Ligand binder design. Sequence first.
Ligand SMILES: [Mg+2]
Ligand SMILES: [Mg+2]
Ligand SMILES: [Mg+2]
Ligand SMILES: [Zn+2]
Lengths: 129, 150, 102, 206, 64, 78
Amino acid sequence: DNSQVFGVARIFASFNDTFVHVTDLSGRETIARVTGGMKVKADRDESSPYAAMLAAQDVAAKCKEVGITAVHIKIRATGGTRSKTPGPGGQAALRALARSGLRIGRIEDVTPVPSDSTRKKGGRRGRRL
Amino acid sequence: TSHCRFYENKYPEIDDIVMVNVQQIAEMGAYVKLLEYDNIEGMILLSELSRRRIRSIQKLIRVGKNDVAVVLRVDKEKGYIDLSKRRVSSEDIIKCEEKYQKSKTVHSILRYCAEKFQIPLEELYKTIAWPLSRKFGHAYEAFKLSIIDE
Amino acid sequence: PKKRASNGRNKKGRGHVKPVRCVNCSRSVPKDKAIKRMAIRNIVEAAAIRDLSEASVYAEYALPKTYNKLHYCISCAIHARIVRVRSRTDRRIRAPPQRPRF
Amino acid sequence: FVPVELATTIPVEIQQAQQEIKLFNKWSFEDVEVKDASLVDYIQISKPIYVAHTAGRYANKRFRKAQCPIVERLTNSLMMNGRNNGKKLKAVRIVKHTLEIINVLTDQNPLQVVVDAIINSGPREDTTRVGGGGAARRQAVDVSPLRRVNQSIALLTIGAREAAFRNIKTIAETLAEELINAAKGSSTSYAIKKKDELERVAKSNR
Amino acid sequence: KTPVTLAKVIKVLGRTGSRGGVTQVRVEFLEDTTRTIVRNVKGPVREGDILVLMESEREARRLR
Amino acid sequence: SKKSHKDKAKHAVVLDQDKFDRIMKEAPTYRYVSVSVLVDRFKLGGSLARVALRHLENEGIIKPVSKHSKQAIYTRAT
RNA sequence: CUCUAACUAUAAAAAUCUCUCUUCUC
Ligand SMILES: [Mg+2]
Ligand SMILES: [Mg+2]
Ligand SMILES: [Mg+2]
Ligand SMILES: [Zn+2]
């Protein structure tokens, strides 16, 4: 190591209100819980890339204040029962973290996936929007 | 002269709740005066206007009335107010109503002197407002205590 | 009338198939008539591969990818442009539409 | 300096040493430039002109508009709400009087004042109504250089109009004062005010 | 803060938007010419122009 | 319709001795004075404003540079 | 006559409808 302060970004990117929540290597001690909805006013563009980008920039400022420079991102979607698909905001949050000085390492896909559990929501014919 | 803002300073603070008076609508939204803070114009954007979908606009703004809202960002350099109507709690709406009525009562009280003695309203309100609003609460309780014991 | 010889199902000898739930509309549908797309994707796009690269220790990273197998319904698939209504004589061509990227 | 003998002599101020072509024989197309590097090639001060009115065929193609002198474009856009439509002669005299006024108050070669007002008055980020049906909301977009220039100039002339209407103040003076207010970042200018409002509606609705 | 940025378009990426008036453009920044970004611009554009951006972080997709 | 104009007289069309002195004193220190610039300072109605302007062009208090109808450009002399 | 690589992203609302229907051999 080059005397680095490693961290984990572990982005959670649903289809609404992208989450950015950095913690230590132990994963227990949280830093900069600020999310996408924190930085947008509509309460509905929370999934938009702008919310995630501003959240990531504020996280980066907090990390520079606390010394964490290089990161280990754990990209997450809602997964499980819900669509198994990454949200649009989380990727933009990851890019914004990449820009603002910080360094990356070992980006991970930590999407929780079931082995056909949980007879899940929707009914037979499913969504009828 | 209806002037000389109710509270300590002319320029509204951040994320603060107000009730506003509507005067005109150009095309985007409406930059309308305020009777909760100093009379500097505060502008509402249509994205932050109606809880229901935007199909009729003249019935929800009702130009020339009092409407509860909350100011998002304030420009204290030369005077621009970004003002928002939607994200207001159903329980804080009562807070806005009561606070606006209290400030209205203060305005009504401290106008009689300025018009009876033709002295500056701003000067008299500046003299009176130091023990008035900042002591520990609104003026009305202080005025009632004073009439029962000055 | 017989629209498709294979009944548009692709079961033909199983009697019953285990249903699967659509990714978007959440409709239960037989797993064979559950039009399926292997969404194999790089975890970030080319507009950010650079941004991540110069902000990366461990030069020339493998940049791990994300894989998924989307089990659409048919209504979502036709609505969300995955499957297209083709002409009568062109239905009988089951090859993928000619090398998406060449 | 080189007075020329003729059977009919054009007067001295028009005849003496004017191989330095001037707009109205008082202001130089030299010593004036575009302060912002972005808008260059779209504020055409390169070609010297003696009268801000030419039989220009400046709308046949997509981008022959940028070859029109900026002063001439201001003249043609000055006369909107064209009860005065046509009547470029009076527009030319209005803008010429405006240039004289700008020369009087803080001279600074009024050509440079016009350029500075254009630079400070053209919005840089705008919005567009592309929200489909349900969530009718407006989204941010960047502004093209020519679009920036046209918005600046039209906003300036419409501000001159709003000042001039049913007002003792003459439109030459109104437009001149708008150019003083727009040369600096003064908020009293109507054009700068609308520019800032549009910039903010773009900023907030990214 | 005045973080105004300048970028020269190198390729016009057709025209996007339901209105049919907004252009996608691939602009390389005048500063740090090695980097390119695609953004939306309202108004007439041609390659070789230089355009002004208040923000340079935002990547612009199709406007639906 | 409504009494919203609330416009006062706002003008004295014919000068007095006091306004005569104010005009002849504030004639300099103004780089530019026009008909409506003179109207702006409330000291004249405006029809006599140009009368006063040309009457300040008697001993060269204010030099003229352009003499077009409805718009003449006058700058203080030094 | 030797060839197995690249990807994006929308579902607001929208009901109803009167006559009068008939003619081809050289
Ligand atoms: Mg449907
Ligand atoms: Mg059928
Ligand atoms: Mg099938
Ligand atoms: Zn489906």
